[PDB]
């Protein structure tokens, strides 16, 4: 619908230490904007940069142009799931999955998050990340499902960037029309948070396009 | 504190391509000879829809024969124990993250294991169970930032011939400060010795020895 | 130093899976429009046994339209010029490293290019010539240790459908000190417009435009 | 075709971060004992501004001791010889691509080598010459598409301690049809034994043995 709700729970671990986060939000799928409030329920205070989780906290929240097949809006009411590997340039790897279903007007997420091999003096365990930069994801079809890759980066305290290579697989639960090669522009931002990030208000803006011209 | 005849008790909770499962095991082995064996049972999520082989190297470098001219990081870490973290990067994009918290209760090592695999193509040898076994391997172990790292590029043999490659990145963290070793190697040979039709029961063996390369 | 119309002169020497070749080209473009076109000729090692597409992005981010609010690293570097390094990483392990030394003579840029590709499998799309073209792309550019870096993972479309991925890592080096830009993007669309049977003659075009991501940028006045 | 004492003659042309150089070498070794040594001389581009260590493993798996139960792909390929392709992926993004055409003239192997490295950061151990030596390694060899592959993640020890990692991917191509081996390993130990101040003269050694993993192989009679 023009205005949808979000309900979510994430369970996971970072370098073996487990935690849990729940969230509630709302957004406009046809405008490509969304926002949510996240609450840490287990494993607080989190000893890692919150930023590594933010892109796991839904490509249905992306404004798709008419000449571009929309894989995500097609997959409802049944929904879809996605898998992702997030490979940071210092060897830290985060694996995340999301099972997305629809109940009335509210999307429901079942998220699992697992990070390993973050060095203790790195920007993630030391919390020296500022935010994610805007990015452009590339989407193409492979083995009857939709892939999404993007080489992005996090800005660091005092300048410089921390790169991360995203590899996402999107699987609609039911068979939908497959799209051509296209792009999605992203901008995710933490707009407010408390000292230990037990409460986080997170926003994303996403728009699909087909590149130049 | 470390005795020629130790026991293994383990539980793994995890998921592959989003589908969860759980496996328990009971084992035994000889740390000073570098040999071990266990019986594993699927307790949740069976029958497993992926090749069992991707899990076996998660199911303890204390079971490796270390010569005396090589500092033994793992046997030093007991009785307090150690933990390890690992990424396993398959050449077709399948990636498995696993963690193991290892403690010691009397004569039995106890594992708390987490396993999470993503992005395995449905047409690949992991989801279609076309792996035969792990080949023998030689791991590279070195120190970085006060902890021990171990990297190895190995492979799985496939049923119509050929090999399916995997890059290992392990971080070993002793629970308290031990002597750190110099650059060395561990030779591995892990084998499934018997199993069920669906791999609900698996008998797993490993043989390991540390060395220093040529000569 | 930068004129609305510029010329291009280049020579590329290199090898793929150990077999050497050489290519010369002449071109023209408009740096402030971010467009260029050239004519390329194989001079050595023909006919080439690999897909020509792996060479095209080696054949000048000075040919990229920069908005007025984004610092332009490349147009600043002339008349002295700049150099760049890059090593493409294709998903089946075939890897190409490339270098370009770019200088200026009057109104003509001059390239000295080296291209070296290794480990292309015989049954892969490069050695079997099953690539159609490069898809449009969006490059990510950021600063590291006083020089400009460029990352983008893009793809080639394949003859029977589907895509063949490649990871780009470029380093750009101005020869003299210039102003460094913030993290930004460059959109690309490179196209082979015409070629003969064995790709002896190739007409190649590129369109490149810089932006700042987010909400793409005319407001009634 | 293979005699217990063979000689080596080589020339390498290449560049690192765009700056070209050339090195010639003369050597000797015992293929059946897996040992070799050579003396290398910089002929162009000296003094080299990068750590010499990145070139040493490019300066022939015929010099590897094979047990009788493991098929020898390399000693089989002569007198025709073989060629190999290789990418070396360092953990900070430095990438070196190398090719070698190995031929045989009498009792002397002849190498034609190309070496091309890009994106080595200026503050890294290669451009600062902070490497000490390659650690010994164990390469893993397997067959793919009828040719021989070699993978090994290895490392260089660094001046102030610690290690600098590199990912090797080699493709070996015999010039004639030979019998293909099963999955096996080769243990390596390459050493610079002497060099002059700026590495214009370098004496280089390698020791190599193939095996089949543990249990490492008289049985007391």
PDB file of C-alpha atoms in Angstrom, chain C:
ATOM      1  CA  UNK C   1      44.706  23.821 -20.664  1.00  0.00           C
ATOM      2  CA  UNK C   2      41.395  22.133 -21.116  1.00  0.00           C
ATOM      3  CA  UNK C   3      39.578  22.955 -24.344  1.00  0.00           C
ATOM      4  CA  UNK C   4      36.013  22.052 -25.332  1.00  0.00           C
ATOM      5  CA  UNK C   5      37.442  19.813 -28.074  1.00  0.00           C
ATOM      6  CA  UNK C   6      40.442  17.596 -27.354  1.00  0.00           C
ATOM      7  CA  UNK C   7      42.305  14.872 -29.225  1.00  0.00           C
ATOM      8  CA  UNK C   8      43.532  11.458 -28.090  1.00  0.00           C
ATOM      9  CA  UNK C   9      46.616   9.460 -29.068  1.00  0.00           C
ATOM     10  CA  UNK C  10      47.434   6.113 -27.499  1.00  0.00           C
ATOM     11  CA  UNK C  11      49.491   2.973 -27.858  1.00  0.00           C
ATOM     12  CA  UNK C  12      48.814  -0.132 -25.794  1.00  0.00           C
ATOM     13  CA  UNK C  13      51.329  -2.934 -25.373  1.00  0.00           C
ATOM     14  CA  UNK C  14      50.343  -6.041 -23.526  1.00  0.00           C
ATOM     15  CA  UNK C  15      49.585  -9.718 -23.343  1.00  0.00           C
ATOM     16  CA  UNK C  16      46.723 -12.027 -22.446  1.00  0.00           C
ATOM     17  CA  UNK C  17      47.540 -15.521 -21.146  1.00  0.00           C
ATOM     18  CA  UNK C  18      51.104 -14.885 -22.307  1.00  0.00           C
ATOM     19  CA  UNK C  19      50.326 -13.974 -25.923  1.00  0.00           C
ATOM     20  CA  UNK C  20      51.546 -10.441 -26.713  1.00  0.00           C
ATOM     21  CA  UNK C  21      49.787  -7.845 -28.848  1.00  0.00           C
ATOM     22  CA  UNK C  22      49.816  -4.113 -29.537  1.00  0.00           C
ATOM     23  CA  UNK C  23      47.137  -1.534 -30.360  1.00  0.00           C
ATOM     24  CA  UNK C  24      47.265   2.099 -31.463  1.00  0.00           C
ATOM     25  CA  UNK C  25      44.384   4.568 -31.444  1.00  0.00           C
ATOM     26  CA  UNK C  26      43.418   8.134 -32.310  1.00  0.00           C
ATOM     27  CA  UNK C  27      40.450   9.994 -30.890  1.00  0.00           C
ATOM     28  CA  UNK C  28      38.564  13.114 -29.870  1.00  0.00           C
ATOM     29  CA  UNK C  29      36.160  14.155 -27.153  1.00  0.00           C
ATOM     30  CA  UNK C  30      34.709  16.947 -25.041  1.00  0.00           C
ATOM     31  CA  UNK C  31      35.924  16.861 -21.406  1.00  0.00           C
ATOM     32  CA  UNK C  32      33.212  19.170 -20.074  1.00  0.00           C
ATOM     33  CA  UNK C  33      30.525  16.977 -21.671  1.00  0.00           C
ATOM     34  CA  UNK C  34      32.170  13.756 -20.473  1.00  0.00           C
ATOM     35  CA  UNK C  35      32.109  12.174 -23.948  1.00  0.00           C
ATOM     36  CA  UNK C  36      34.788  10.734 -26.212  1.00  0.00           C
ATOM     37  CA  UNK C  37      35.225   8.487 -29.235  1.00  0.00           C
ATOM     38  CA  UNK C  38      38.231   6.897 -30.905  1.00  0.00           C
ATOM     39  CA  UNK C  39      39.377   4.572 -33.667  1.00  0.00           C
ATOM     40  CA  UNK C  40      41.641   1.676 -32.644  1.00  0.00           C
ATOM     41  CA  UNK C  41      43.809  -0.620 -34.778  1.00  0.00           C
ATOM     42  CA  UNK C  42      45.575  -3.846 -33.868  1.00  0.00           C
ATOM     43  CA  UNK C  43      49.219  -3.538 -34.913  1.00  0.00           C
ATOM     44  CA  UNK C  44      50.785  -6.642 -33.361  1.00  0.00           C
ATOM     45  CA  UNK C  45      49.554 -10.059 -32.294  1.00  0.00           C
ATOM     46  CA  UNK C  46      46.479 -10.143 -34.524  1.00  0.00           C
ATOM     47  CA  UNK C  47      44.047 -11.629 -34.832  1.00  0.00           C
ATOM     48  CA  UNK C  48      43.500 -11.444 -31.077  1.00  0.00           C
ATOM     49  CA  UNK C  49      42.218 -14.722 -29.535  1.00  0.00           C
ATOM     50  CA  UNK C  50      40.446 -13.057 -26.584  1.00  0.00           C
ATOM     51  CA  UNK C  51      37.324 -10.962 -26.145  1.00  0.00           C
ATOM     52  CA  UNK C  52      38.139  -7.372 -27.090  1.00  0.00           C
ATOM     53  CA  UNK C  53      35.797  -6.101 -24.360  1.00  0.00           C
ATOM     54  CA  UNK C  54      38.405  -6.682 -21.641  1.00  0.00           C
ATOM     55  CA  UNK C  55      40.533  -3.912 -23.187  1.00  0.00           C
ATOM     56  CA  UNK C  56      37.991  -1.143 -23.676  1.00  0.00           C
ATOM     57  CA  UNK C  57      37.963   0.470 -20.238  1.00  0.00           C
ATOM     58  CA  UNK C  58      41.751   0.648 -20.384  1.00  0.00           C
ATOM     59  CA  UNK C  59      41.546   2.646 -23.614  1.00  0.00           C
ATOM     60  CA  UNK C  60      40.747   8.992 -18.963  1.00  0.00           C
ATOM     61  CA  UNK C  61      38.570  10.180 -16.224  1.00  0.00           C
ATOM     62  CA  UNK C  62      39.303  13.651 -17.583  1.00  0.00           C
ATOM     63  CA  UNK C  63      36.494  12.703 -20.001  1.00  0.00           C
ATOM     64  CA  UNK C  64      33.886  12.906 -17.267  1.00  0.00           C
ATOM     65  CA  UNK C  65      31.438  15.731 -16.631  1.00  0.00           C
ATOM     66  CA  UNK C  66      31.968  17.088 -13.110  1.00  0.00           C
ATOM     67  CA  UNK C  67      29.355  19.261 -11.404  1.00  0.00           C
ATOM     68  CA  UNK C  68      30.591  22.594 -10.147  1.00  0.00           C
ATOM     69  CA  UNK C  69      30.241  21.516  -6.495  1.00  0.00           C
ATOM     70  CA  UNK C  70      32.491  18.408  -6.842  1.00  0.00           C
ATOM     71  CA  UNK C  71      36.247  18.951  -6.964  1.00  0.00           C
ATOM     72  CA  UNK C  72      37.649  17.727 -10.292  1.00  0.00           C
ATOM     73  CA  UNK C  73      40.912  15.870  -9.637  1.00  0.00           C
ATOM     74  CA  UNK C  74      41.681  15.108 -13.295  1.00  0.00           C
ATOM     75  CA  UNK C  75      41.178  18.456 -15.025  1.00  0.00           C
ATOM     76  CA  UNK C  76      43.322  19.999 -12.270  1.00  0.00           C
ATOM     77  CA  UNK C  77      46.250  17.711 -13.080  1.00  0.00           C
ATOM     78  CA  UNK C  78      46.861  19.115 -16.516  1.00  0.00           C
ATOM     79  CA  UNK C  79      48.963  20.320 -18.329  1.00  0.00           C
ATOM     80  CA  UNK C  80      51.345  17.982 -16.453  1.00  0.00           C
ATOM     81  CA  UNK C  81      48.904  15.077 -16.597  1.00  0.00           C
ATOM     82  CA  UNK C  82      48.413  12.092 -14.344  1.00  0.00           C
ATOM     83  CA  UNK C  83      48.840   8.324 -14.299  1.00  0.00           C
ATOM     84  CA  UNK C  84      46.584   5.491 -13.214  1.00  0.00           C
ATOM     85  CA  UNK C  85      46.891   1.847 -12.215  1.00  0.00           C
ATOM     86  CA  UNK C  86      44.262  -0.849 -12.233  1.00  0.00           C
ATOM     87  CA  UNK C  87      43.785  -4.598 -11.868  1.00  0.00           C
ATOM     88  CA  UNK C  88      40.441  -6.039 -12.967  1.00  0.00           C
ATOM     89  CA  UNK C  89      39.300  -9.160 -11.121  1.00  0.00           C
ATOM     90  CA  UNK C  90      36.918 -11.362 -13.111  1.00  0.00           C
ATOM     91  CA  UNK C  91      34.761 -13.852 -11.226  1.00  0.00           C
ATOM     92  CA  UNK C  92      36.372 -16.941 -12.844  1.00  0.00           C
ATOM     93  CA  UNK C  93      39.876 -15.887 -11.800  1.00  0.00           C
ATOM     94  CA  UNK C  94      41.032 -14.211 -14.992  1.00  0.00           C
ATOM     95  CA  UNK C  95      42.781 -11.020 -13.898  1.00  0.00           C
ATOM     96  CA  UNK C  96      44.003  -7.970 -15.916  1.00  0.00           C
ATOM     97  CA  UNK C  97      46.289  -5.254 -14.601  1.00  0.00           C
ATOM     98  CA  UNK C  98      46.566  -2.011 -16.526  1.00  0.00           C
ATOM     99  CA  UNK C  99      48.542   1.210 -16.339  1.00  0.00           C
ATOM    100  CA  UNK C 100      48.143   4.452 -18.244  1.00  0.00           C
ATOM    101  CA  UNK C 101      50.539   7.373 -18.317  1.00  0.00           C
ATOM    102  CA  UNK C 102      48.642  10.371 -19.711  1.00  0.00           C
ATOM    103  CA  UNK C 103      50.417  13.490 -20.998  1.00  0.00           C
ATOM    104  CA  UNK C 104      49.331  16.590 -22.938  1.00  0.00           C
ATOM    105  CA  UNK C 105      50.764  17.921 -26.213  1.00  0.00           C
ATOM    106  CA  UNK C 106      48.950  21.047 -27.312  1.00  0.00           C
ATOM    107  CA  UNK C 107      45.331  19.908 -27.420  1.00  0.00           C
ATOM    108  CA  UNK C 108      45.998  16.148 -27.674  1.00  0.00           C
ATOM    109  CA  UNK C 109      46.216  13.738 -24.751  1.00  0.00           C
ATOM    110  CA  UNK C 110      48.826  11.005 -25.184  1.00  0.00           C
ATOM    111  CA  UNK C 111      48.495   7.623 -23.462  1.00  0.00           C
ATOM    112  CA  UNK C 112      51.214   5.064 -22.730  1.00  0.00           C
ATOM    113  CA  UNK C 113      49.265   1.917 -21.811  1.00  0.00           C
ATOM    114  CA  UNK C 114      50.327  -1.472 -20.474  1.00  0.00           C
ATOM    115  CA  UNK C 115      47.806  -4.317 -20.191  1.00  0.00           C
ATOM    116  CA  UNK C 116      48.521  -7.769 -18.761  1.00  0.00           C
ATOM    117  CA  UNK C 117      45.859 -10.444 -18.304  1.00  0.00           C
ATOM    118  CA  UNK C 118      46.501 -13.836 -16.759  1.00  0.00           C
ATOM    119  CA  UNK C 119      44.676 -17.048 -15.819  1.00  0.00           C
ATOM    120  CA  UNK C 120      41.799 -16.771 -18.281  1.00  0.00           C
ATOM    121  CA  UNK C 121      40.320 -20.292 -18.585  1.00  0.00           C
ATOM    122  CA  UNK C 122      40.097 -21.694 -22.102  1.00  0.00           C
ATOM    123  CA  UNK C 123      36.370 -22.466 -21.785  1.00  0.00           C
ATOM    124  CA  UNK C 124      35.497 -19.075 -20.304  1.00  0.00           C
ATOM    125  CA  UNK C 125      33.685 -16.207 -22.008  1.00  0.00           C
ATOM    126  CA  UNK C 126      36.927 -14.286 -22.610  1.00  0.00           C
ATOM    127  CA  UNK C 127      38.865 -16.963 -24.478  1.00  0.00           C
ATOM    128  CA  UNK C 128      35.698 -18.226 -26.205  1.00  0.00           C
ATOM    129  CA  UNK C 129      34.640 -14.647 -27.120  1.00  0.00           C
ATOM    130  CA  UNK C 130      31.152 -14.785 -25.599  1.00  0.00           C
ATOM    131  CA  UNK C 131      30.982 -11.229 -24.218  1.00  0.00           C
ATOM    132  CA  UNK C 132      28.500  -8.793 -25.751  1.00  0.00           C
ATOM    133  CA  UNK C 133      29.349  -5.543 -23.999  1.00  0.00           C
ATOM    134  CA  UNK C 134      29.961  -3.748 -20.766  1.00  0.00           C
ATOM    135  CA  UNK C 135      26.930  -2.710 -18.800  1.00  0.00           C
ATOM    136  CA  UNK C 136      26.634   0.882 -17.581  1.00  0.00           C
ATOM    137  CA  UNK C 137      28.333   1.329 -14.249  1.00  0.00           C
ATOM    138  CA  UNK C 138      28.677   3.632 -11.259  1.00  0.00           C
ATOM    139  CA  UNK C 139      32.209   3.966  -9.907  1.00  0.00           C
ATOM    140  CA  UNK C 140      33.022   4.881  -6.312  1.00  0.00           C
ATOM    141  CA  UNK C 141      35.912   7.308  -5.825  1.00  0.00           C
ATOM    142  CA  UNK C 142      37.582   8.140  -2.508  1.00  0.00           C
ATOM    143  CA  UNK C 143      40.888   9.421  -1.195  1.00  0.00           C
ATOM    144  CA  UNK C 144      43.591   7.266   0.377  1.00  0.00           C
ATOM    145  CA  UNK C 145      47.149   8.315   1.278  1.00  0.00           C
ATOM    146  CA  UNK C 146      46.967  11.535  -0.706  1.00  0.00           C
ATOM    147  CA  UNK C 147      45.899   9.924  -4.003  1.00  0.00           C
ATOM    148  CA  UNK C 148      42.513   9.127  -5.534  1.00  0.00           C
ATOM    149  CA  UNK C 149      41.110   5.588  -5.544  1.00  0.00           C
ATOM    150  CA  UNK C 150      38.360   4.146  -7.691  1.00  0.00           C
ATOM    151  CA  UNK C 151      36.278   1.060  -6.968  1.00  0.00           C
ATOM    152  CA  UNK C 152      33.419  -0.441  -8.952  1.00  0.00           C
ATOM    153  CA  UNK C 153      32.224  -3.992  -9.459  1.00  0.00           C
ATOM    154  CA  UNK C 154      30.497  -4.061 -12.832  1.00  0.00           C
ATOM    155  CA  UNK C 155      29.644  -6.789 -15.327  1.00  0.00           C
ATOM    156  CA  UNK C 156      29.702  -7.879 -18.949  1.00  0.00           C
ATOM    157  CA  UNK C 157      26.583  -9.262 -20.579  1.00  0.00           C
ATOM    158  CA  UNK C 158      27.006 -12.702 -22.126  1.00  0.00           C
ATOM    159  CA  UNK C 159      26.036 -14.129 -25.492  1.00  0.00           C
ATOM    160  CA  UNK C 160      23.535 -16.616 -24.093  1.00  0.00           C
ATOM    161  CA  UNK C 161      22.196 -14.230 -21.474  1.00  0.00           C
ATOM    162  CA  UNK C 162      23.424 -13.610 -17.983  1.00  0.00           C
ATOM    163  CA  UNK C 163      26.373 -11.588 -16.771  1.00  0.00           C
ATOM    164  CA  UNK C 164      30.084 -12.130 -16.111  1.00  0.00           C
ATOM    165  CA  UNK C 165      31.364 -10.093 -13.137  1.00  0.00           C
ATOM    166  CA  UNK C 166      34.561  -8.113 -12.757  1.00  0.00           C
ATOM    167  CA  UNK C 167      35.863  -6.105  -9.811  1.00  0.00           C
ATOM    168  CA  UNK C 168      37.692  -2.893 -10.619  1.00  0.00           C
ATOM    169  CA  UNK C 169      40.321  -1.308  -8.398  1.00  0.00           C
ATOM    170  CA  UNK C 170      41.873   1.841  -9.870  1.00  0.00           C
ATOM    171  CA  UNK C 171      44.465   4.206  -8.400  1.00  0.00           C
ATOM    172  CA  UNK C 172      44.764   7.688  -9.956  1.00  0.00           C
ATOM    173  CA  UNK C 173      47.954   9.708  -9.468  1.00  0.00           C
ATOM    174  CA  UNK C 174      48.249  13.367 -10.345  1.00  0.00           C
ATOM    175  CA  UNK C 175      51.811  14.264 -11.244  1.00  0.00           C
ATOM    176  CA  UNK C 176      51.652  17.661  -9.417  1.00  0.00           C
ATOM    177  CA  UNK C 177      49.764  18.705  -6.279  1.00  0.00           C
ATOM    178  CA  UNK C 178      46.020  19.346  -6.812  1.00  0.00           C
ATOM    179  CA  UNK C 179      42.947  19.758  -4.594  1.00  0.00           C
ATOM    180  CA  UNK C 180      41.558  16.464  -3.308  1.00  0.00           C
ATOM    181  CA  UNK C 181      37.818  15.728  -3.675  1.00  0.00           C
ATOM    182  CA  UNK C 182      35.358  14.182  -1.255  1.00  0.00           C
ATOM    183  CA  UNK C 183      33.841  10.709  -1.684  1.00  0.00           C
ATOM    184  CA  UNK C 184      31.805  10.750  -4.902  1.00  0.00           C
ATOM    185  CA  UNK C 185      30.672   8.706  -7.917  1.00  0.00           C
ATOM    186  CA  UNK C 186      31.166   8.569 -11.685  1.00  0.00           C
ATOM    187  CA  UNK C 187      28.520   7.015 -13.942  1.00  0.00           C
ATOM    188  CA  UNK C 188      29.902   5.249 -17.017  1.00  0.00           C
ATOM    189  CA  UNK C 189      28.602   3.904 -20.303  1.00  0.00           C
ATOM    190  CA  UNK C 190      31.281   2.577 -22.667  1.00  0.00           C
ATOM    191  CA  UNK C 191      30.208   1.102 -26.008  1.00  0.00           C
ATOM    192  CA  UNK C 192      31.810  -0.504 -29.029  1.00  0.00           C
ATOM    193  CA  UNK C 193      29.985   1.202 -31.873  1.00  0.00           C
ATOM    194  CA  UNK C 194      31.550  -0.619 -34.848  1.00  0.00           C
ATOM    195  CA  UNK C 195      34.182  -3.270 -35.542  1.00  0.00           C
ATOM    196  CA  UNK C 196      35.339  -5.624 -38.287  1.00  0.00           C
ATOM    197  CA  UNK C 197      35.237  -9.439 -38.156  1.00  0.00           C
ATOM    198  CA  UNK C 198      38.461  -9.921 -36.160  1.00  0.00           C
ATOM    199  CA  UNK C 199      38.229  -6.624 -34.224  1.00  0.00           C
ATOM    200  CA  UNK C 200      41.166  -5.259 -36.216  1.00  0.00           C
ATOM    201  CA  UNK C 201      39.367  -1.906 -36.373  1.00  0.00           C
ATOM    202  CA  UNK C 202      37.191  -0.758 -33.477  1.00  0.00           C
ATOM    203  CA  UNK C 203      35.239   2.458 -32.933  1.00  0.00           C
ATOM    204  CA  UNK C 204      34.769   2.991 -29.202  1.00  0.00           C
ATOM    205  CA  UNK C 205      32.678   5.537 -27.275  1.00  0.00           C
ATOM    206  CA  UNK C 206      32.408   6.448 -23.608  1.00  0.00           C
ATOM    207  CA  UNK C 207      30.026   8.635 -21.637  1.00  0.00           C
ATOM    208  CA  UNK C 208      30.908   9.537 -18.047  1.00  0.00           C
ATOM    209  CA  UNK C 209      29.198  11.915 -15.570  1.00  0.00           C
ATOM    210  CA  UNK C 210      30.074  12.637 -11.953  1.00  0.00           C
ATOM    211  CA  UNK C 211      27.565  13.048  -9.114  1.00  0.00           C
ATOM    212  CA  UNK C 212      27.193  12.907  -5.326  1.00  0.00           C
ATOM    213  CA  UNK C 213      24.775   9.997  -4.964  1.00  0.00           C
ATOM    214  CA  UNK C 214      21.521  10.192  -2.921  1.00  0.00           C
ATOM    215  CA  UNK C 215      18.777  12.365  -4.524  1.00  0.00           C
ATOM    216  CA  UNK C 216      19.904  12.975  -8.084  1.00  0.00           C
ATOM    217  CA  UNK C 217      19.954  16.610  -9.134  1.00  0.00           C
ATOM    218  CA  UNK C 218      16.054  23.167 -12.952  1.00  0.00           C
ATOM    219  CA  UNK C 219      13.667  24.084 -10.133  1.00  0.00           C
ATOM    220  CA  UNK C 220      11.349  26.399 -12.037  1.00  0.00           C
ATOM    221  CA  UNK C 221      13.988  29.148 -11.842  1.00  0.00           C
TER     222      UNK C 221
END
